Design a protein around this ligand. Structure first.
Ligand SMILES: *[C@@H]1O[C@H](CO)[C@@H](O[C@@H]2O[C@H](CO)[C@@H](O)[C@H](O)[C@H]2NC(C)=O)[C@H](O)[C@H]1NC(C)=O
Ligand SMILES: *[C@@H]1O[C@H](CO)[C@@H](O[C@@H]2O[C@H](CO)[C@@H](O)[C@H](O)[C@H]2NC(C)=O)[C@H](O)[C@H]1NC(C)=O
Ligand SMILES: *[C@@H]1O[C@H](CO)[C@@H](O[C@@H]2O[C@H](CO)[C@@H](O)[C@H](O)[C@H]2NC(C)=O)[C@H](O)[C@H]1NC(C)=O
Ligand SMILES: *[C@@H]1O[C@H](CO)[C@@H](O[C@@H]2O[C@H](CO)[C@@H](O)[C@H](O)[C@H]2NC(C)=O)[C@H](O)[C@H]1NC(C)=O
Ligand SMILES: *[C@@H]1O[C@H](CO)[C@@H](O[C@@H]2O[C@H](CO)[C@@H](O)[C@H](O)[C@H]2NC(C)=O)[C@H](O)[C@H]1NC(C)=O
Ligand SMILES: *[C@@H]1O[C@H](CO)[C@@H](O[C@@H]2O[C@H](CO)[C@@H](O)[C@H](O)[C@H]2NC(C)=O)[C@H](O)[C@H]1NC(C)=O
Ligand SMILES: *[C@@H]1O[C@H](CO)[C@@H](O)[C@H](O)[C@H]1NC(C)=O
Ligand SMILES: *[C@@H]1O[C@H](CO)[C@@H](O)[C@H](O)[C@H]1NC(C)=O
Ligand SMILES: *[C@@H]1O[C@H](CO)[C@@H](O)[C@H](O)[C@H]1NC(C)=O
Ligand SMILES: *[C@@H]1O[C@H](CO)[C@@H](O)[C@H](O)[C@H]1NC(C)=O
Lengths: 366, 236, 49
């Protein structure tokens, strides 16, 4: 009171010092049951992979993808993400995903990277410098490599020009390095642009087949449809907490309500656009929200000149959640709020320091 | 397998009155016993709605469709701008068991019809992007509202048992939201699909305009009455 | 080539203004704890120029 009044002495009266509000205890987040997982299983567990110059392209949209399990897998030798960190990929998301799967050499794994050149990087597949996404490569010597030679897999070696980013060349035209024309028959200056792979079980690390899948994300103006699941938790009641119901955030105490929502609404507001009822996305029941209590505090004093003991009144607050003045002395509950410090009597005198609802206090003790 | 027909399906393009039909819930908010004023795209009261007894019609901002259906003759709808493989096209068909929604660069013929002895009105189906399957939409009155805003396709629907003969009845019935599509297309025209076997289709089409309405919510949160503010001075 | 110039690459949290960090410890990128041993999902945070 002295600090608010900016004086070292106070005369008899009642003064309003500050406010009081119940602090939230914990937080809860609710979300639907989560379904329609992206079909990453049939890509990373596919029986066969196409050639490097015939890389399989797959479109991913309208599903939920959990990258945590992909990241936590220890069976993948190379997992390189350039545009974004893999850990934070579960939060942000784009409108569609393109997957390019193929098989290359162990020594050619670093050909497919921004600012990289090579036989594959200039004749089979090219990645732009500004490319964003991830690349996952893992050895396939035990499966793709053959004792008789996995000659089914081939790679482009000859072309007059290079490859543009995200461009596929599958042309089988006889490359003509020189100026000597060829009528479809390779000669002195004509060679076949494609060469077969000769993987064997005993070849050595670096020449073994390696399965490589490159994931790219695009953010066309259409709304984003593919990204990580939204983690949820349990719910509590009869406690002032803060909540994030399906993106709708707010603080208050949640109780069971008798309102009957019509089967397609999600929440309700009474008037002046203040939400009062919600529906949890999982249990599909109607809950009621009440703002947890708050109110001002006032001090009753008989004047500094007389004494030094005071009384404290919390305005419009039930005498159930008051909290050194937590218990103190006898506590009275009045239509004006709650009062601590004074004593209730059965007499009736003139009114000295008004309090409210027809009652007031005075100094005898108070 | 699609060929042009001989007779021209020149359905008489009559006009009739809208009365007080074509009101839908604007959002997913619950309100009890309150009057709420909202500005959005609606069908004006006592408007001029076109009656057909299969031309190509413009889409404009939105479309209100009404069918005095008897034994499920109408089957589907087509949406697009160029109606070929040069631009994305949308197709919706409610067959005997389910509803199928496709977004592809279809190659339609010059006269679509479902035919009976599934989909054979397109010569080719290339670059398919979006697919969807769900429960069927459908002496009954079938009312639908189609809107397309910022890459979202909203479809509202309502079914009514009626005994009146020809024109729309006098009454009130709000339209509940049915389906949402998160796809971005710039549709400008649309077409109706009939399963006419090789061997007479009455419906109503109206357009929408932006305006303000006043809606009344009862105790249970159902829209029971509305007022059009851009009308006679008493309404204002 | 100069390799005396190194910069941080991974951190548990962001740096406060006018803050200095010189500790060089393995980073546990993955859920598997490195336990002070470099391995899978465990990297040195200092990268040279
Ligand atoms: C390919 O199949 C294997 C075999 O099931 C998958 O590995 C399983 O991954 C789950 C993920 O938690 C584990 O619970 C299982 O124990 C694993 N199985 C084995 C035998 O280790 C792998 O995830 C699949 N690849 C995908 C889905 O991309
Ligand atoms: C979301 O998933 C939960 C978890 O299964 C569903 O809750 C089940 O509801 C049935 C209905 O009687 C109960 O028999 C089960 O015991 C509940 N599960 C649990 C774990 O208690 C809930 O119905 C689902 N909701 C939606 C909208 O999918
Ligand atoms: C302060 O809170 C208590 C408990 O929440 C209230 O006591 C309740 O009063 C109602 C109305 O008479 C009874 O139906 C309950 O049984 C009471 N509960 C208990 C635990 O006694 C009290 O009324 C509140 N204070 C005021 C002024 O309303
Ligand atoms: C009505 O439409 C449904 C939905 O497309 C059809 O059911 C599908 O039929 C195709 C035909 O090859 C199958 O591949 C799908 O697996 C079916 N899906 C389901 C959910 O059943 C149905 O055949 C159609 N019926 C008629 C008479 O056209
Ligand atoms: C076939 O589909 C692809 C993608 O499904 C289309 O590629 C898009 O084309 C638009 C046109 O400007 C670009 O803005 C996009 O960036 C492209 N990629 C996407 C959407 O991933 C392609 O145009 C389609 N072909 C035809 C003839 O319409
Ligand atoms: C609005 O909701 C109330 C509450 O359920 C409905 O009142 C019920 O109506 C049915 C049949 O009309 C009765 O069998 C119930 O006994 C009624 N409940 C109560 C608590 O009285 C009411 O019908 C709904 N519709 C309207 C227009 O009020
Ligand atoms: C109260 O004030 C009066 C005059 O204002 C003074 O005489 C008296 O001493 C004061 N009481 C104290 C200081 O306890
Ligand atoms: C006196 O007041 C107390 C509470 O302050 C009450 O319990 C008691 O009944 C009252 N007695 C009389 C005689 O009024
Ligand atoms: C509807 O339009 C027709 C022709 O355009 C006209 O004859 C008729 O009077 C109109 N009805 C109205 C405006 O209610
Ligand atoms: C539709 O076409 C218009 C003009 O041709 C263009 O401005 C708009 O971006 C297009 N929208 C889509 C979704 O193709």
């Amino acid at each position: 009171t002295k600090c608010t009044l900016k004086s070292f002495t106070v005369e008899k009266g009642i003064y309003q010092t500050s406010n009081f509000r119940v602090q939230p205890t914990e937080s809860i987040v609710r979300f639907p049951n989560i379904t329609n997982l992206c079909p990453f299983g049939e890509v990373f567990n596919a029986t066969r992979f196409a050639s490097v110059y015939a890389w399989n392209r797959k479109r991913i949209s309208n599903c939920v993808a959990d990258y945590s399990v992909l990241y936590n897998s220890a069976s993948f030798s190379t997992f390189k993400c350039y545009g974004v960190s893999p850990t934070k990929l579960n939060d942000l998301c784009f409108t569609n995903v393109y997957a390019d799967s193929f098989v290359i050499r162990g020594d050619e794994v670093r050909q497919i990277a921004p600012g990289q050149t090579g036989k594959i990087a200039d004749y089979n597949y090219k990645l732009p410098d500004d490319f964003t996404g991830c690349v996952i490569a893992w050895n396939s010597n035990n499966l793709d490599s053959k004792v008789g030679g996995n000659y089914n897999y081939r790679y482009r070696l000859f072309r007059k020009s290079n490859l543009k980013p995200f461009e596929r060349d599958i042309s089988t035209e006889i490359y003509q390095a020189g100026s000597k024309p060829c009528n479809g028959v390779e000669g002195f200056n004509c060679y076949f642009p494609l060469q077969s792979y000769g993987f064997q079980p005993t070849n050595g690390v670096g020449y073994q087949p390696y399965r490589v899948v490159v994931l790219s994300f695009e953010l066309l103006h259409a709304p984003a449809t593919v990204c990580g699941p939204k983690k949820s938790t349990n719910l509590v009641k009869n406690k002032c907490v803060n909540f994030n119901f399906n993106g709708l955030t707010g603080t208050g105490v949640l109780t069971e309500s008798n309102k009957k929502f019509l089967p397609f609404q999600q929440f309700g507001r009474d008037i002046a656009d203040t939400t009062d009822a919600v529906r949890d996305p999982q249990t599909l029941e109607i809950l009621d929200i009440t703002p947890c209590s708050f109110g001002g505090v006032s001090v009753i004093t008989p004047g500094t000149n007389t004494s030094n003991q005071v009384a404290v009144l919390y305005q419009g607050v039930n005498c159930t959640e008051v909290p050194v003045y937590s218990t103190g002395s006898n506590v009275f509950q009045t239509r004006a709020g709650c009062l601590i410090g004074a004593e209730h009597v059965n007499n009736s005198y003139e009114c000295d320091i008004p309090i409210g609802a027809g009652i007031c206090a005075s100094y005898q003790s108070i | 397998q699609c060929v042009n027909l001989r007779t021209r399906t020149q359905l008489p393009p009559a006009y009739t009155n809208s009365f007080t039909r074509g009101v839908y819930y604007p959002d997913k908010v619950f309100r009890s016993s309150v009057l709420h004023s909202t500005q959005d795209l609606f069908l004006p009261f006592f408007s001029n709605v076109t009656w057909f007894h299969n031309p190509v019609l413009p889409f404009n901002d939105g479309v209100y469709f009404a069918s005095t259906e008897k034994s499920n003759i109408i089957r589907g709808w087509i949406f697009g701008t160029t109606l070929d493989s040069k631009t994305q096209s949308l197709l919706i068909v409610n067959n005997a068991t389910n509803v199928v929604i496709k977004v592809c660069e279809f190659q339609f013929c010059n006269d679509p019809f479902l035919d009976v002895y599934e989909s054979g009105v397109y010569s080719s189906a290339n670059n398919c992007t979006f697919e969807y399957v769900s429960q069927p939409f459908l002496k009954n009155l079938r009312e639908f509202v189609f809107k397309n805003i910022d890459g979202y396709f909203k479809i509202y629907s309502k079914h009514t048992p009626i005994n009146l003969v020809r024109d729309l009845p006098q009454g009130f019935s709000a339209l509940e939201p049915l389906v949402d599509l998160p796809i971005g297309i710039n549709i400008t025209r649309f077409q109706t699909l009939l399963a006419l076997h090789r061997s007479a289709a009455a419906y109503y089409v109206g357009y929408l305009q932006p305006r303000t309405f006043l809606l009344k919510y009862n105790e249970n949160g159902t829209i029971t009455d509305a007022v059009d503010c851009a009308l006679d001075p008493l309404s204002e």
